[PDB]
Design a protein around this nucleic acid. Structure first.
Ligand SMILES: Nc1nc2c(ncn2[C@H]2C[C@H](O)[C@@H](COP(=O)(O)NP(=O)(O)OP(=O)(O)O)O2)c(=O)[nH]1
Ligand SMILES: [Mg+2]
Ligand SMILES: [Mg+2]
Length: 430
DNA sequence: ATGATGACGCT
DNA sequence: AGCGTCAT
């Protein structure tokens, strides 16, 4: 009772851009705005692979990983923007630049953890404390939370979405105990006020809309964010967790979407996150290991301790290209030319990184995939990254992988390569 | 024939 | 050091 931690010590938010690459293209080309629209990579094979989809197009069944030709069958008037192609590969520079726009704005409110090209966590615990003491003790008006959902409300004793949102928010605010600065529900609420302000600033200064989750930890914040996309934010209180998790498939929890989540389901014979509470910590540790067991024991109770890391920049800079089926690289000269293309993009991004961020990469990781191998990587080799020079980087990459070539002859490569991947790592201050 | 490519755990 | 997992 008095000694059992409830995991309510922090206020954490996750902000994620709505259909991000689509919004980047819609900002640039007004003709695409408020329309079913998707962003695709390449064009020749089946119209291009879709990697982002406007909410208007999602209503037709268009999804990520769909070929554009197939999406067009679902949505004949679907509009398409293609990712820039440079040196024969996809070039995502425009979206990396848009990302920096958003991250730099979020950084004004608190130190962020950049978690992807379009989302960041923020620890608002301190900001919340300062806002609480400076609002004197005033109650929090619903007007300060104009796009906020309270997960689980309304409950108990309007048939349209906005009406439901407000009734839930009203129930929540009417119940708040604003006289107690230590109340976690209050801290979350103030967090939500701050996130409304953050999201307003993002939209005002970039034109991009986003959604957000506010909770006590990263996993719940991320989950909350998704509950009411697009252009809304969701507060998941500690109190909301039992009902929320009681019907929540285990795979919806980040890190559980793969084989670990599958084994939890199979070994324990359960479906929902809440069902995990039945097991002792030792029981979970026995099935899934010490780290996973402890994590699962706490997580099914809404508790997680992973900190928001002070990290606004990516830890690695990399680029890759697949060469599927018949396009697999089967000659020495081919392998070298594409290593050079990848290396040239990497040099330009590295040089820009050094100027912007006062750091230099010191290690180069070369990854390949061979024909027949379904793994992401068949083989990885590293070498020193001592100069931002594409010819040197590509030559060095060839050197460390050249012995994979089981060909007898000079100019051929066997088995043919279905992927090349250069990744610059181990940054140092410069 | 998804693709591009990013974080991070394990040994 | 190099491989596996999860992600989208
Ligand atoms: N090259 C590449 N880019 C991708 C891929 N998957 C996603 N992206 C790019 C494209 C995405 O726009 C962007 C952000 O990914 P999300 O936040 O997971 N999806 P979004 O923001 O589109 O929609 P919403 O968040 O509203 O559900 O990352 C991929 O497989 N490959
Ligand atoms: Mg997004
Ligand atoms: Mg995202």
């Amino acid at each position: 009772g008095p000694h059992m931690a409830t995991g309510q010590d922090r206020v954490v938010a996750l902000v994620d851009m709505d259909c991000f690459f689509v919004q980047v293209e819609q900002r640039q080309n007004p003709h695409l705005r408020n329309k079913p629209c998707a962003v695709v990579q390449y064009k020749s094979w089946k119209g291009g692979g879709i990697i982002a989809v406007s909410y208007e197009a999602r209503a037709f069944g268009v999804t990520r990983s769909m070929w554009a030709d197939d999406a067009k069958k679902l949505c004949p008037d679907l509009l398409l923007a293609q990712v820039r192609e440079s040196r024969g590969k996809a070039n995502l520079t425009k979206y990396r630049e848009a990302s920096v726009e958003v991250m730099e704005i979020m950084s004004r409110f608190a130190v962020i953890e950049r978690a992807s090209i379009d989302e960041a966590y923020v620890d608002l615990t301190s900001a919340v404390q300062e806002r609480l003491q400076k609002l004197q003790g005033q109650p929090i008006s619903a007007d300060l939370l104009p796009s906020t959902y309270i997960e689980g409300l309304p409950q108990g004793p309007t048939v349209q979405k906005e009406g439901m949102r407000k009734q839930g928010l009203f129930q929540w605010l009417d119940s708040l105990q604003i006289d107690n600065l230590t109340s976690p529900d209050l801290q979350l609420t103030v967090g939500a006020v701050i996130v409304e302000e953050m999201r307003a600033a993002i939209e005002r200064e970039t034109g991009f809309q986003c959604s957000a989750g506010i909770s006590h930890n990263k996993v719940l914040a991320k989950l909350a964010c998704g509950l009411n996309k697009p252009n809304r934010q969701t507060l998941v209180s500690h109190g909301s967790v039992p009902q929320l998790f009681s019907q929540m498939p285990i795979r919806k929890i980040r890190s559980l979407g793969g084989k670990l989540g599958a084994s939890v389901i199979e070994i324990l014979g359960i479906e929902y996150m809440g069902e995990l509470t039945q097991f002792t910590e030792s029981q979970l540790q026995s099935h899934f290991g010490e780290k996973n067991g402890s994590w699962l024991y706490a997580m099914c109770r809404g508790i997680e301790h992973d900190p928001v890391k002070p990290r606004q920049l990516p830890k690695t800079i990399g680029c890759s290209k697949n060469f599927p089926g018949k396009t697999a690289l089967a000659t020495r000269e081919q392998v070298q030319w594409w290593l050079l293309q990848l290396a040239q993009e990497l040099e330009e991004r590295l040089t820009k990184d050094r100027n912007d961020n006062d750091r230099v990469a010191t290690q180069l990781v070369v990854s390949i995939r061979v024909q027949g191998d379904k793994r992401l990587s068949s083989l990885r080799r590293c070498c020193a990254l001592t100069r931002y020079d594409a010819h040197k980087m590509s030559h060095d990459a060839f050197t460390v992988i050249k012995n994979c070539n089981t060909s007898g002859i000079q100019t051929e490569w066997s088995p043919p390569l279905t992927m090349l991947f250069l990744c610059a790592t181990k940054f140092s201050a410069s």
